[PDB]
Write a protein that binds this ligand. Structure first.
Ligand SMILES: CC[C@H](C)[C@H](NC(=O)C[C@H](O)[C@H](CC1CCCCC1)NC(=O)CCNC(=O)[C@H](Cc1ccccc1)NC(=O)N1CCC(N)CC1)C(=O)NCc1cnc(C)nc1N
Length: 330
């Protein structure tokens, strides 16, 4: 079996992408953020504190006939930017663009951090990392992809994010009409529970390619691209006026400057990110200073290939026994 769903940017900056998901019987459609950097499927619901919901669509367990409370199970997660959510657990039917999985763990939020409440376009998350990161206690639960793996024509899923436009999430097959040239596969380390791989190097603009190993994770749930201090400093040095701002918390540049492209290595292949992709707008309404899409990871503890890098490629997440990552131009 297979499934295909359209993913849409939440705002004109591509800060995040939402995908419609059918939950329960009869279906209750919620727009979730697909996150390959987490392994929990949580949603706003009729249980969430009333004061913590501001326009999001909620899931109503009592309205679903397939819904069933997972007695004693609880969840609690906190993300890299500090956001947090927690609540109880249910099992129910979940369909993503045709692909149906019964008995999927649906984590119902009882508490959500203020950053979530302020975000009316995101109804919840669908984690696509490795099941080892699931926070359901005391009985860990499997992810949606893990649950469908056995029924898919191919234990894979693909990410095709668009720049200032809609994209596609496919489950169980490769659309050979969606990319150009060949697909380059690279080893994945599942040790930390992430889609962790190693880039082979980089280039700034038309500069010479630098051979250097960069260890990072493929995370659709992260907006920007976070690389080592040395790499990031070399990029912004090619932009007149750019500088690291203490007050803003990152690299900023004059809104009128042209950004050079950024190249990252996949094996012997190279993926090119257009400079337009790296512009994230005025730091503040009306400002002539703009925020950069490539920032330092010196503080994170790991490099992150977020949407900024991913949307420049057709990405294959091969969940075989020996998982791999596939990158192609498009
Ligand atoms: C089981 C935890 C799980 C693995 C967890 N995983 C993650 O945090 C990675 C995951 O991909 C999450 C998923 C996000 C979380 C926030 C809401 C949207 C989804 N990603 C991040 O945290 C990346 C940092 N945040 C982001 O990149 C958000 C994403 C966003 C976009 C639109 C609207 C709202 C949020 N955007 C931005 O920060 N920016 C974009 C806008 C730009 N103008 C400002 C910068 C984790 O590592 N948590 C850290 C953690 C906490 N506590 C402990 C004890 N250990 C930990 N490792």
């Amino acid at each position: 079996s297979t499934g295909s769903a359209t993913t849409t940017p939440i705002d004109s900056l591509d800060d995040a992408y939402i995908t419609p998901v059918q939950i329960g019987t009869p279906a209750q459609t919620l727009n979730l953020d697909f996150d390959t950097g987490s392994s929990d499927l949580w949603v706003f619901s009729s249980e969430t504190t009333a004061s913590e919901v501001d326009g999001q669509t909620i899931y109503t367990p009592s309205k679903s006939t397939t819904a069933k409370l997972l007695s004693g199970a609880t969840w609690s997660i906190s993300y890299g930017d500090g956001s947090s959510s927690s609540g109880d657990v249910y099992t129910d039917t979940v369909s993503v663009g045709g692909l149906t999985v019964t008995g999927q763990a649906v984590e119902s939020a009882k508490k959500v951090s203020s950053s979530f409440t302020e975000d009316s376009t995101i109804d919840g998350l669908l984690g696509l990392a490795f099941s080892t990161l699931n926070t359901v206690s005391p009985t860990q639960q499997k992810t949606f992809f893990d649950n469908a793996k056995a029924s898919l024509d191919s234990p894979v899923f693909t990410a095709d994010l668009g720049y200032h436009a809609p994209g596609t999430y496919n489950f169980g097959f490769i659309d050979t009409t969606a990319y150009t040239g060949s697909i380059t596969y690279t080893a994945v380390s599942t040790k930390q529970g992430f889609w962790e791989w190693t880039s082979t190097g980089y280039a700034v603009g038309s500069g010479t390619f630098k051979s250097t190993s960069i260890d990072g994770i493929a995370d659709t749930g992260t907006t920007l691209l976070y690389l080592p201090a040395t790499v990031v400093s070399a990029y912004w040095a090619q932009v007149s006026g750019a500088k690291s701002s203490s007050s803003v918390g990152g690299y900023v540049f004059p809104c009128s400057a042209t950004l050079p492209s950024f190249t990252f290595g996949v094996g012997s292949a190279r993926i090119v990110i257009p400079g337009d992709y790296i512009d994230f707008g005025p730091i503040s309404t009306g400002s002539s200073s703009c925020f950069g899409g490539i920032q330092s990871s010196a503080g994170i503890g790991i490099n992150i290939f977020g949407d900024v890098a991913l949307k420049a490629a057709f990405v294959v997440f091969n969940g075989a026994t020996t998982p791999t990552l596939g990158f192609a131009s498009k």
